[PDB]
Amino acid sequence: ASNAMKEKVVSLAQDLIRRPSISPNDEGCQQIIAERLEKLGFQIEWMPFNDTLNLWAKHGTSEPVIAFAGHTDVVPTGDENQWSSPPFSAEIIDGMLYGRGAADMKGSLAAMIVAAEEYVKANPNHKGTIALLITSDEEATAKDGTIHVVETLMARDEKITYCMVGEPSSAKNLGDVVKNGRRGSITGNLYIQGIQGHVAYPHLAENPIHKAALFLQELTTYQWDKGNEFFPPTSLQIANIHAGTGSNNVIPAELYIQFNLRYCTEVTDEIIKQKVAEMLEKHNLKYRIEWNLSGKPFLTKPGKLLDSITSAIEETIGITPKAETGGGTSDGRFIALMGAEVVEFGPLNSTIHKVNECVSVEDLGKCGEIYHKMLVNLLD
Amino acid sequence: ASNAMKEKVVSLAQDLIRRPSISPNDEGCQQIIAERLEKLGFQIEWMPFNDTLNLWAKHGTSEPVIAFAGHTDVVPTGDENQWSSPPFSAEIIDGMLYGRGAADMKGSLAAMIVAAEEYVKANPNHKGTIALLITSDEEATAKDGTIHVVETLMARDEKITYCMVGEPSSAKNLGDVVKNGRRGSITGNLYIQGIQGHVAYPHLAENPIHKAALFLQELTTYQWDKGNEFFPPTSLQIANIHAGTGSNNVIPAELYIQFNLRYCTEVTDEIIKQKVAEMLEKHNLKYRIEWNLSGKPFLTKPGKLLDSITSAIEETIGITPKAETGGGTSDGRFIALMGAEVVEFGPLNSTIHKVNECVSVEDLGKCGEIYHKMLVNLLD
Ligand SMILES: N[C@H](CCC[C@H](N)C(=O)O)C(=O)O
Ligand SMILES: N[C@H](CCC[C@H](N)C(=O)O)C(=O)O
Ligand SMILES: [Zn+2]
Ligand SMILES: [Zn+2]
Ligand SMILES: [Zn+2]
Ligand SMILES: [Zn+2]
């Protein structure tokens, strides 16, 4: 009779998926959420800043404080034509909920919310505080999101004891992985200068695409490290590359390369910057580069939260998750600044940021059950 | 007292440079030209087709027919901020006329026009026909320009005996080079397919930039040939390269590469297509490619026109031009279809398609003198 909760999770998820909340625009997601939480006695606190909307919702007044954390923004869809169903359709086909944000992360956001709602309804005088910390910019610059909330709470010495981040942690089967940390993320925006001219007079010009070809090949194959006991290896990906005026008979003046590294503690942001500089010098390239550090590697100190979620997954679906630190990053690293233990769990990540993103509705239901059991394990 | 003609050439040139005639838009250039030719008794015939304007102007009724050929369109400027003077300012600074189209090819277009005007004024009952064949799209697709005029003339068996193309042929000093032929030009528009996804989950995706890096490096360094007695070597240039959604945490689905070859007769369009296909296969790349042949190599049969222009340059500025076939292409190849001898001569090409394009005003004056002497040599 908790197929009832499963339906609540699914309809909320669909609600949210239908809102085209490309970072940092919330498109009304948090309003929906805040409305239903308020009706159940949660204290609502809005913390907008610049173009970002943030929500801090609480039920309870004392420690321990357990916060569910997540984001309502989603990455761009791409041509809606490339999608079998419209990206914001929230269609359910053969047990799969389709849509941008279905797996990253509106599905599990809905699951966490319903778990919190149901727990609080069942246990009005529960020990501790159940909170939700929701931002509309996790996917982009993220300068005014979760980190703004964290700064506000710290400045008035408000505490978070435990934080469960609902990012999609699972690899092949729901519950097979939880995350106890993340690699860092740093992006280079690299401009290599050539000299514009006529394609048929290349000796009077300098084609930066040709000059940088070897560099590009070395950059994409260079082995930064082999990981270590705590993290998978550092990985570099070129996200964007652009040169040219659109004309076929003009040599472009400049080549733009944007590349990102998800890095482990075998290297640092400074080691990465120095090595790239050294590669550019070795290839005698004229350039300018702008570096943007999104975050450093982070590991949480394991304790009762890791125990509680690991046990909840075992108790609900019968397997033991492996604790890992791969994949992307999350706002967990900000929340760790408060001294909170941070652990992540959510649905399959196999379709995130892809065309035809989707999530199993059976998995969303079990997620709700798992998040609920986690609360019981922690507070009771 | 032919500093007088020099001033006519310069002011016409400035007139034309001020008109932002990005291919195929004439922006009124040919109207100016046709107006001043008509006043001197030239028969004007407009041959517009689609978005291209073409002009066929004649003085005389009999053979031999000598046609001056050129184009009023210019390649895009780029950010006007990168220019010392506005690109359409037509400023003269220290003996240099600055502007897009100054050297390619409004300067020499003006010189040819004034040479024709002055010759016809001096010799109203001249032998032969003096013609001008002017198009507003030489630089772009060129499907409706000079080739449209050529087709029209051939269809009514109208003849061109000799054609002087005023493209900028000179390398270091005015008159050091004339052109008796050109390499071919073929462009590949290449799309390499990957799989879009999350930068931090590259194993669930396929980054086409990474997959194609080695190919790109091989393509830009592959030696097609070493030229031969008639042409310089084949040269490949990548003009445009684009991949990415603008996001730094998404792996792009597709990489676009546009590349052009200026090729000599050691290879063919078919050999080029087959080799590129073979390189792509060797690197196991999934792709689609669209080929666009702009023209094949061409050599003119030397005769009285090459003699006349070579002698005119010697007689006017004292040096002997070398006959060469390098640089870009020209509409000469179309006009050759009529059986005409085609030779090109014009000012320095060192700044064409570049920022701060300019041309020496002293050279424009001597060009006028050279084109005039050429007519005398041919007709008298
Ligand atoms: N500006 C941040 C956004 C991170 C979003 C995170 N969810 C991920 O892509 O793992 C970065 O480039 O790391
Ligand atoms: N669509 C033609 C334009 C040629 C213009 C010609 N003046 C040159 O660039 O040499 C090509 O790609 O060859
Ligand atoms: Zn997410
Ligand atoms: Zn994401
Ligand atoms: Zn030209
Ligand atoms: Zn040109």
Side-chain angles (χ1 to χ4, degrees), chain A residues 1 4 6-126 128-300 302-380, chain B residues 1 4 6-126 128-300 302-380:
Chain A
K6 172 191 181 180
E7 249 31 63
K8 283 175 140 298
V9 170
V10 174
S11 43
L12 175 50
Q14 288 183 288
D15 247 273
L16 302 171
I17 287 160
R18 284 182 195 115
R19 306 173 167 279
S21 52
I22 319 300
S23 323
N25 301 291
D26 189 56
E27 298 291 347
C29 290
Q30 293 175 35
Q31 276 182 51
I32 291 174
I33 294 166
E35 191 190 344
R36 59 192 288 154
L37 295 176
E38 182 186 352
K39 292 186 186 196
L40 301 173
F42 278 72
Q43 207 200 320
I44 303 308
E45 172 169 16
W46 297 108
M47 300 189 189
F49 199 70
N50 294 331
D51 295 310
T52 302
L53 182 59
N54 301 290
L55 171 65
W56 178 238
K58 289 188 307 200
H59 191 282
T61 54
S62 65
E63 321 229 280
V65 181
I66 167 63
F68 291 111
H71 61 93
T72 52
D73 58 313
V74 296
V75 297
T77 61
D79 256 69
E80 298 215 0
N81 293 322
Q82 212 85 18
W83 284 66
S84 302
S85 302
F88 303 109
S89 56
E91 271 182 51
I92 295 163
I93 302 162
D94 277 286
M96 302 296 299
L97 176 55
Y98 289 86
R100 170 62 81 233
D104 180 14
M105 63 168 284
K106 290 176 177 184
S108 50
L109 184 57
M112 292 187 295
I113 290 169
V114 174
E117 289 180 343
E118 291 307 314
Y119 181 88
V120 166
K121 290 188 290 180
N123 302 273
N125 305 309
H126 65 86
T129 303
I130 297 175
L132 288 99
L133 197 174
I134 303 174
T135 181
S136 70
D137 182 9
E138 184 272 348
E139 295 278 28
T141 62
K143 298 154 150 290
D144 303 323
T146 299
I147 185 62
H148 178 68
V149 175
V150 169
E151 288 171 358
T152 300
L153 300 175
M154 290 184 68
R156 70 202 196 191
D157 296 293
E158 178 162 352
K159 321 185 171 301
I160 295 181
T161 314
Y162 310 113
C163 174
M164 166 53 52
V165 186
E167 298 283 5
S169 62
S170 295
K172 295 296 205 179
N173 301 105
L174 181 71
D176 58 7
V177 178
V178 295
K179 307 241 179 123
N180 61 280
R182 305 286 205 147
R183 292 174 295 171
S185 175
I186 185 172
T187 302
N189 307 274
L190 172 59
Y191 303 80
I192 288 161
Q193 283 77 33
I195 297 165
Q196 175 188 296
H198 196 312
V199 119
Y201 297 83
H203 59 289
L204 307 178
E206 199 177 66
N207 191 320
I209 309 174
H210 295 215
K211 285 282 173 174
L214 265 164
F215 165 78
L216 187 68
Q217 203 277 330
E218 168 174 36
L219 186 70
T220 58
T221 60
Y222 177 74
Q223 183 178 79
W224 293 93
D225 52 62
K226 300 169 71 65
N228 54 36
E229 166 185 344
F230 305 102
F231 296 99
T234 297
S235 161
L236 182 154
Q237 286 291 129
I238 304 181
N240 293 277
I241 184 165
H242 298 102
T245 69
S247 293
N248 74 339
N249 61 351
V250 174
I251 294 166
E254 189 165 75
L255 166 67
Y256 169 68
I257 304 169
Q258 184 184 60
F259 59 96
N260 170 259
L261 294 91
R262 303 310 178 99
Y263 71 95
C264 79
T265 46
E266 291 300 303
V267 299
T268 63
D269 58 328
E270 209 57 39
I271 283 163
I272 287 164
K273 295 169 172 175
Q274 191 49 58
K275 180 70 206 184
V276 174
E278 165 192 329
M279 297 171 167
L280 288 163
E281 297 162 22
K282 161 181 162 187
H283 291 276
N284 300 114
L285 293 172
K286 309 174 198 84
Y287 71 96
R288 76 194 160 87
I289 191 161
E290 304 157 10
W291 288 101
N292 191 322
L293 179 60
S294 287
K296 295 192 180 175
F298 136 83
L299 283 182
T300 208
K304 196 172 183 202
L305 179 62
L306 181 58
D307 291 343
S308 296
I309 188 66
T310 296
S311 288
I313 291 166
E314 293 178 341
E315 293 151 358
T316 306
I317 56 179
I319 62 173
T320 304
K322 294 171 176 187
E324 303 185 346
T325 58
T329 61
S330 78
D331 286 354
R333 64 177 182 289
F334 301 131
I335 292 157
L337 301 173
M338 310 189 59
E341 182 189 356
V342 177
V343 180
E344 323 196 23
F345 169 71
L348 259 29
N349 50 46
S350 61
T351 71
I352 68 175
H353 297 205
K354 293 175 152 172
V355 308
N356 292 326
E357 182 185 346
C358 62
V359 74
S360 160
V361 347
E362 199 66 16
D363 283 1
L364 291 185
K366 299 199 265 224
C367 278
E369 290 176 55
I370 290 164
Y371 293 135
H372 192 325
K373 188 53 183 267
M374 177 203 82
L375 287 177
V376 176
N377 284 345
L378 272 178
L379 297 172
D380 311 333
Chain B
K6 172 191 181 180
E7 249 31 63
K8 283 175 140 298
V9 170
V10 174
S11 43
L12 175 50
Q14 288 183 288
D15 247 273
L16 302 171
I17 287 160
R18 284 182 195 115
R19 306 173 167 279
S21 52
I22 319 300
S23 323
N25 301 291
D26 189 56
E27 298 291 347
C29 290
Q30 293 175 35
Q31 276 182 51
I32 291 174
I33 294 166
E35 191 190 344
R36 59 192 288 154
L37 295 176
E38 182 186 352
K39 292 186 186 196
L40 301 173
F42 278 72
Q43 207 200 320
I44 303 308
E45 172 169 16
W46 297 108
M47 300 189 189
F49 199 70
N50 294 331
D51 295 310
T52 302
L53 182 59
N54 301 290
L55 171 65
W56 178 238
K58 289 188 307 200
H59 191 282
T61 54
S62 65
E63 321 229 280
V65 181
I66 167 63
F68 291 111
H71 61 93
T72 52
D73 58 313
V74 296
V75 297
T77 61
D79 256 69
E80 298 215 0
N81 293 322
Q82 212 85 18
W83 284 66
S84 302
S85 302
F88 303 109
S89 56
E91 271 182 51
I92 295 163
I93 302 162
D94 277 286
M96 302 296 299
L97 176 55
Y98 289 86
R100 170 62 81 233
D104 180 14
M105 63 168 284
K106 290 176 177 184
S108 50
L109 184 57
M112 292 187 295
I113 290 169
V114 174
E117 289 180 343
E118 291 307 314
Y119 181 88
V120 166
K121 290 188 290 180
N123 302 273
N125 305 309
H126 65 86
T129 303
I130 297 175
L132 288 99
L133 197 174
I134 303 174
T135 181
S136 70
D137 182 9
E138 184 272 348
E139 295 278 28
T141 62
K143 298 154 150 290
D144 303 323
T146 299
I147 185 62
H148 178 68
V149 175
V150 169
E151 288 171 358
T152 300
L153 300 175
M154 290 184 68
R156 70 202 196 191
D157 296 293
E158 178 162 352
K159 321 185 171 301
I160 295 181
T161 314
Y162 310 113
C163 174
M164 166 53 52
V165 186
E167 298 283 5
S169 62
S170 295
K172 295 296 205 179
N173 301 105
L174 181 71
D176 58 7
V177 178
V178 295
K179 307 241 179 123
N180 61 280
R182 305 286 205 147
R183 292 174 295 171
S185 175
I186 185 172
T187 302
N189 307 274
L190 172 59
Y191 303 80
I192 288 161
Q193 283 77 33
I195 297 165
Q196 175 188 296
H198 196 312
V199 119
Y201 297 83
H203 59 289
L204 307 178
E206 199 177 66
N207 191 320
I209 309 174
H210 295 215
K211 285 282 173 174
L214 265 164
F215 165 78
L216 187 68
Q217 203 277 330
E218 168 174 36
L219 186 70
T220 58
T221 60
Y222 177 74
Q223 183 178 79
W224 293 93
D225 52 62
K226 300 169 71 65
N228 54 36
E229 166 185 344
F230 305 102
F231 296 99
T234 297
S235 161
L236 182 154
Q237 286 291 129
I238 304 181
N240 293 277
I241 184 165
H242 298 102
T245 69
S247 293
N248 74 339
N249 61 351
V250 174
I251 294 166
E254 189 165 75
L255 166 67
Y256 169 68
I257 304 169
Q258 184 184 60
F259 59 96
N260 170 259
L261 294 91
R262 303 310 178 99
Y263 71 95
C264 79
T265 46
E266 291 300 303
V267 299
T268 63
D269 58 328
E270 209 57 39
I271 283 163
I272 287 164
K273 295 169 172 175
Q274 191 49 58
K275 180 70 206 184
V276 174
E278 165 192 329
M279 297 171 167
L280 288 163
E281 297 162 22
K282 161 181 162 187
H283 291 276
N284 300 114
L285 293 172
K286 309 174 198 84
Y287 71 96
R288 76 194 160 87
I289 191 161
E290 304 157 10
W291 288 101
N292 191 322
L293 179 60
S294 287
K296 295 192 180 175
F298 136 83
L299 283 182
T300 208
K304 196 172 183 202
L305 179 62
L306 181 58
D307 291 343
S308 296
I309 188 66
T310 296
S311 288
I313 291 166
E314 293 178 341
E315 293 151 358
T316 306
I317 56 179
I319 62 173
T320 304
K322 294 171 176 187
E324 303 185 346
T325 58
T329 61
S330 78
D331 286 354
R333 64 177 182 289
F334 301 131
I335 292 157
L337 301 173
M338 310 189 59
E341 182 189 356
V342 177
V343 180
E344 323 196 23
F345 169 71
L348 259 29
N349 50 46
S350 61
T351 71
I352 68 175
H353 297 205
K354 293 175 152 172
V355 308
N356 292 326
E357 182 185 346
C358 62
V359 74
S360 160
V361 347
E362 199 66 16
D363 283 1
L364 291 185
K366 299 199 265 224
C367 278
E369 290 176 55
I370 290 164
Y371 293 135
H372 192 325
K373 188 53 183 267
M374 177 203 82
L375 287 177
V376 176
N377 284 345
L378 272 178
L379 297 172
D380 311 333

